[PDB]
Structures are given as structure tokens and as C-alpha cells.
Amino acid sequence: KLPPGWEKRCFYFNRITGKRQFERPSD
Amino acid sequence: KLPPGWEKRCFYFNRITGKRQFERPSD
């Protein structure tokens, strides 16, 4: 796994709303 | 699957180097 200080950040991007979430959208 | 316009994205942040990647660094 990756090194210290690192922190994976998986955000959902709704290019429609070109907005971001930290979740898999409900839709 | 994801709703329209959505795409699950993920960038790693090494707060050490407070920089970002789209990967879990080699380490």
C-alpha cells in the first residue's frame, strides 16, 4: 500500500452536474 | 451501474507532499 501522508480519495463526478461526491450516487 | 454523467474517480493525496495522484503510490 501507499506511503505516509497519503490518503486515497475516491469521489464520484457527475459531469452532468460536473459536481463531486464522496459517494456512489443514488441517482 | 452509476447514474448519468457519473463516473467514480479517485485521487491519492500525499499530505506530506500535499500533492495528488490518480493512483495508490508505489510507496
Which of B3, B4, B24 is closest to B14 using CA atoms?
A: B24
Instruction: Tell me chain B's radius of gyration from C-alpha atoms.
Output: 12
The CA distance from A18 to B13, in Å, is 21
Chain A residues in contact with B27 (beta carbon < 8 A): 1-3, 6
Contact in structure between A11 and A17 (CB atoms under 8 Å): no
Contact in structure between B19 and A21 (CB atoms under 8 Å): no
Tell me the residues of B at the A interface, defined by beta carbons under 8 Å apart. Answer: 2-18, 20, 24-27
What is the signed CA dihedral for B7, B20, B12, B5, rounded to 10 degrees? Answer: -10
